[PDB]
Design a protein around this ligand. Structure first.
Ligand SMILES: *[C@@H]1O[C@H](CO)[C@@H](O)[C@H](O)[C@H]1NC(C)=O
Ligand SMILES: [Ca+2]
Ligand SMILES: [Cu+2]
Ligand SMILES: [Cu+2]
Ligand SMILES: [Cu+2]
Ligand SMILES: [Cu+2]
Ligand SMILES: [Cu+2]
Ligand SMILES: [Cu+2]
Ligand SMILES: [Cu+2]
Ligand SMILES: [Cu+2]
Ligand SMILES: [Cu+2]
Ligand code: NA
Ligand code: NA
Length: 1034
């Protein structure tokens, strides 16, 4: 079915906050909104000149088709069904060159609308740059896997300009393309769906817009003291918005109770774009799983479905606490249209009544005064721990006055419900609030602190009179529920209707949470946080434990920002010997109050994660905070299942929660730790213990095949950019000069070459011949050799350390005989034995082959960054049936900012490479930045080669991330979409990666060309995390 859209690009002034306040917002005052919104001498305000896409009736562009009010600054909605040919007539009426570039969809090289080194010429680069007054017809076909069999009828894709994509997007050229299964549309709207909304969550950065200078000229009434480097000024140009509406100003999100709604969501921007969308008071699903928070990163694409309930005005907010207080909030309205309630139904409903007080403790984040992993004193000189535990003149130390939720037996708040051995691990968390689907939950909350507080659940149903957070206008008079003053008591009633419970496909119990909502951005960090567990009807025993489960554990990961605590002033007075001298604004004082922790515990002090070999364990993980809260919680020694996928590292973000199923199969003391580099260093690491508890057999676990690999750690000179031709050509084509902070030696920087240590394969146990890398492995770059294994194998890794200090080799996923990994000393060879049982391979919904990172354990952080990293691929044991071949291609991609500041080889590289090493200050911020190498397989700006395939190939891409808080990587392939999970049931062209995320993506190349492959985060594209792959004709 052939379709036509006419879309025009025009400059026009956008108003980020048409609506004012008026509005009563979560955790925002006049000051905070003025910061971003108010015009001044040095400040632009809320109106910016932007370039926007608009829809026209005709190839003449003589009249507009009106955008829906809620679309805001997004371009008009394009819809396509599988098999449609879509012609997008685009004309540019702005003052600089621009394009139209589509994600969901198949285009030839002449129809891509993106400029980069691709060996194309003339008849083919006309799409890539549309000057002022130029016009182009973009021919798109909905011919990839499009939406998968496990995807919704309609899914979210995007389009945007791609001259310099990040700057063009920031300028305002972004819109939605909704891609649907044949033929789910009627009159351009999905059948049996009452409402379709599209929302972009973005920190729209007007410092990056092309129109920044134009906007300084127009709105700054004195264009003098404005240093554009000024941090406070840059920040005032960051508009924390949905569809370009800030501070509750998004209009037109209305619907009726019982409406079947689709929300098409995406994130856009840079590293600060860690979003956590909450639709307050509503019940959401995605891919037939219950969702409570929707996380969105740059170019994250997702769609969710909901049936609107509970007539009223409801908040849509980002729960990234930094974003929330910068105005990222909107309202939507659910009207009572007298549509019929499917009035249910439920028998033997129970009341779960809890008695909970907020009260003061002195919370010690590490009672032993040591890092339990190393035995070291936390305040020992030169240690990383000392930053946080040092106590003296302007330094609080390891113990803080906190406010904490605590369970009592009754309404007199006299006798604690004492915390069992099962609940010792809870630590700082309040008691678990649990319920089954159908139940009523009552919570009698008594405030014994000096600040007003509340209880706000995430993921149960409350009437407006029971809501824990205040905002409006939404027709509420009484503040009682949202403001429980210092000696008052309030009894909350919430309910648990089935839409708020697990779906068919979900686990038995969902992890959720509750917290104080009087001021969310301070209260949680004050300590007012606890777990909630919501379960299928009939699944719990009388005490709340799940039926076929031996133990249940709750892990809350966060950077506890004591600077944000309500009690920061009491603590300054109580704990510093010189409170008058404390400057709260000092960066180093701030850092010292950031306690990187798990349940309030740090550096191995978390007690009570103890269990027996073979027991059935459920882990409920969750987090809260801001963009610093990107967590990869790694359980060494065991894997878990979740939604039929096997992993050993769970990614968390603000307000995210997960349920993981584990049956531990080896005795010992293991690490549960955050892999995120800064967090591990900062103390976010703990022990869990698996004990025998009886006996009994000597030797019973799975080995059949044996494979042996000879691998060494070799010191090597590594070049992140051995050519600069790709980079320079990209820039010629964009018409931009621009310097490079990472590669330009300047006066005294290192450049692109660094001494690193890397894993390399050898032919036998003599280690006299390095394996010569084939053409199909050229792409590996810094990665170690592919280690392949089948379920049931034993893998012998014979490891030689040919480098200058101790290192090791260990894999995620894999089973070993003990919890300790032996170091290999320089010149020593050591055999490591990796068992590959069923639990180290695909879960029932994984593709047949799954990737696991292997890495060194001696110093997790510094060994990674020094260069030791590689892919272990584990495949399901080969079926007995197969008659003929197929022709399978494998590529492994590692998205990582190599921080050469943390390399063991930094001093050698200072002395070897800078023209004047005397001049080098390691604490200088510009030098630090020069050594952050933003790469794919340790190569930048198109130097990653060997990604070559043919039309009709079957390709597995094994994508991986590791690293720091900042290593959020959203992997986008131009020219093809991919699929994942068993049988390629899900489809996309952006895959979200974080430290410890590993995934098989299947691709079926069909359009020839040379295609861009890049992370979609602004900072990372600009810094070089980009290459191409080439699809040749059959
Ligand atoms: C750590 O070191 C200091 C000595 O500067 C000492 O006062 C402190 O008690 C030590 N603590 C532990 C738990 O070893
Ligand atoms: Ca082109
Ligand atoms: Cu894109
Ligand atoms: Cu956000
Ligand atoms: Cu929920
Ligand atoms: Cu973390
Ligand atoms: Cu940190
Ligand atoms: Cu990235
Ligand atoms: Cu693209
Ligand atoms: Cu791109
Ligand atoms: Cu960067
Ligand atoms: Na200015
Ligand atoms: Na502003």
């Amino acid at each position: 079915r052939e379709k036509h859209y006419y879309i025009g690009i025009t400059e026009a002034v956008w108003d980020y906050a048409s609506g004012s306040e008026e509005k009563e917002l979560i955790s925002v005052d006049t000051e905070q909104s003025n910061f971003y919104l108010r015009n001044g001498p040095d400040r632009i305000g809320r109106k910016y000149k932007k370039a926007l896409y608009s829809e026209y009736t005709d190839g003449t562009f003589t009249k507009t088709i009106d955008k829906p009010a809620w679309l805001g600054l997004l371009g008009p909605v394009i819809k396509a069904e599988v098999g449609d040919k879509v012609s997008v007539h685009v004309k540019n009426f702005a003052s600089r060159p621009y394009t139209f570039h589509a994600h969901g969809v198949t285009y030839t090289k002449a129809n891509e609308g993106a400029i980069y080194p691709d060996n194309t010429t003339d008849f083919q680069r006309a799409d890539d740059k549309l000057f002022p007054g130029q016009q182009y017809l973009y021919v798109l076909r909905a011919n990839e896997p499009s939406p998968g069999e496990g995807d919704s009828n309609c899914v979210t894709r995007i389009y945007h300009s791609h001259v310099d994509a990040p700057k063009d997007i920031a300028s305002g050229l972004i819109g939605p393309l909704i891609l649907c299964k044949k033929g789910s549309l009627h009159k351009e709207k999905e059948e049996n769906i009452d409402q379709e909304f599209v929302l972009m969550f973005s920190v729209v950065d007007e410092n990056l817009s092309w129109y920044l200078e134009d906007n300084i000229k127009t709105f700054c009434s004195e264009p003098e003291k404005v240093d554009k480097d000024n941090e406070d000024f840059q920040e005032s140009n960051r508009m924390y918005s949905i569809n370009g509406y800030t501070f509750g100003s998004l209009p037109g999100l209305s619907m009726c109770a019982e409406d079947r709604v689709k929300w098409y969501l995406f994130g856009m921007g840079n590293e600060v774009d860690v979003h956590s969308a909450l639709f307050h008071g509503q019940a959401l699903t995605s891919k037939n799983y219950h969702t409570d928070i929707i996380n969105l990163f740059p170019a994250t694409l997702i769609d969710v479905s909901m049936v609107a309930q509970n007539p009223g005005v409801w908040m849509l907010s980002c729960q990234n606490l930094n974003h929330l207080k910068a105005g990222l909030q909107a309202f939507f309205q659910v009207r009572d249209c007298n549509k019929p309630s499917p009035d249910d139904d439920i028998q033997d409903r129970h009341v779960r009544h809890y008695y909970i007080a907020a009260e003061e403790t002195i919370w010690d984040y590490a009672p032993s005064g040591t890092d339990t992993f190393t035995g070291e004193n936390l305040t020992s000189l030169g240690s990383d721990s000392r930053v946080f535990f040092e106590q003296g003149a302007t330094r609080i130390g390891g113990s803080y006055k906190k406010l904490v939720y605590r369970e009592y037996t009754d309404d007199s708040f006299t006798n604690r419900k004492q915390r069992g051995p099962d609940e010792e691990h809870l630590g700082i968390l309040g008691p678990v609030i649990w319920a089954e689907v159908g139940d009523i939950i009552r919570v009698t909350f008594h405030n014994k602190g000096q600040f007003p507080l509340s209880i706000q659940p995430m993921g149960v149903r409350f009437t407006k009179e029971n809501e824990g957070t205040y905002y409006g206008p939404d027709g509420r008079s009484s503040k009682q529920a949202s403001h429980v003053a210092p000696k008052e008591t309030f009894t909350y009633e919430w309910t648990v209707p089935k839409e708020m419970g697990p779906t068919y496909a979900d686990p038995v119990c969902l992890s959720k949470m509750y917290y104080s909502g009087v001021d969310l951005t301070k209260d949680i960090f004050t300590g007012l946080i606890g777990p909630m567990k919501i379960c299928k009807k009939g699944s719990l025993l009388a005490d709340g434990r799940q039926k076929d489960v031996d133990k249940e554990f709750y892990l809350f990961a966060t950077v506890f920002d004591e600077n944000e605590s309500l009690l920061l002033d009491d603590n300054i007075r109580m704990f510093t010997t010189a409170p008058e001298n404390v400057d709260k604004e000092d960066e180093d004082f701030q850092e010292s109050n950031k306690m990187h922790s798990m349940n309030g515990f740090m550096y191995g002090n978390l007690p009570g994660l103890n269990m027996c070999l073979g027991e059935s364990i459920v882990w409920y993980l969750f987090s809260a905070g801001n963009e610093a809260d990107v967590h990869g919680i790694y359980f060494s020694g065991n894997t878990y299942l979740s939604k039929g996928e096997r992993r050993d590292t769970a990614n968390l973000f603000p307000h995210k929660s997960l349920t993981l199923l584990m049956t531990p199969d080896t005795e010992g003391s293991f690490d549960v730790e955050c892999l995120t580099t800064d967090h591990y260093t900062g103390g976010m690491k703990q022990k869990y213990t698996v004990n025998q508890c009886k006996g009994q057999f000597e030797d019973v676990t799975l080995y059949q095949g044996e494979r042996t690999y000879y691998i060494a750690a070799v010191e090597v000179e590594w070049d992140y950019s051995p050519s600069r031709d790709w980079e320079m050509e990209l820039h010629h084509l964009q018409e931009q000069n621009v310097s490079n902070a990472f590669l330009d030696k300047e006066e005294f920087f290192i450049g692109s070459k660094y001494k690193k240590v890397v894993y390399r394969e050898f032919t036998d146990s003599t280690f006299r011949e390095q394996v010569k890398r084939r053409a199909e492995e050229e792409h590996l770059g810094i990665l170690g050799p592919l280690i392949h294994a089948d379920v049931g194998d034993k893998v012998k890794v014979v490891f030689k350390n040919m480098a200058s200090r101790p290192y090791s080799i260990h894999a995620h996923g894999v089973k070993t005989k003990s919890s300790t990994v032996a170091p290999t000393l320089p010149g020593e060879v050591r055999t490591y034995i990796w068992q590959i049982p069923e639990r180290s391979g695909a879960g029932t919904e994984d593709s047949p082959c799954i990737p696991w990172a292997y890495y060194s354990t001696v110093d997790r952080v510094k060994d990674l960054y020094s260069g030791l990293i590689g892919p272990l691929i584990v495949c399901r044991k080969s079926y007995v049936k197969v008659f003929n071949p197929k022709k399978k291609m494998e590529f492994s991609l590692l998205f990582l900012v190599f921080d050469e500041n943390e390399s063991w080889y930094l001093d050698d590289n200072i002395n070897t490479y800078s023209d004047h090493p005397e001049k080098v200050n390691k604490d200088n911020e510009e030098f630090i930045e020069s050594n952050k190498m933003h790469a794919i397989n340790g190569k930048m700006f198109g130097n990653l080669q060997g990604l070559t395939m043919h039309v009709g190939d079957e390709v597995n891409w094994y994508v991986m991330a590791m690293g720091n808080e900042i290593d959020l990587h959203t992997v986008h392939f131009h020219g093809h979409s991919f699929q994942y999970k068993h049988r390629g049931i899900h489809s996309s062209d952006v895959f979200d990666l974080f430290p410890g995320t590993y995934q098989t993506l299947e691709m079926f190349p069909q359009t020839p060309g040379t295609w861009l492959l890049h992370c979609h985060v602004t900072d990372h594209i600009h810094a070089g995390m980009v290459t191409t792959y080439t699809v040749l004709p059959n």
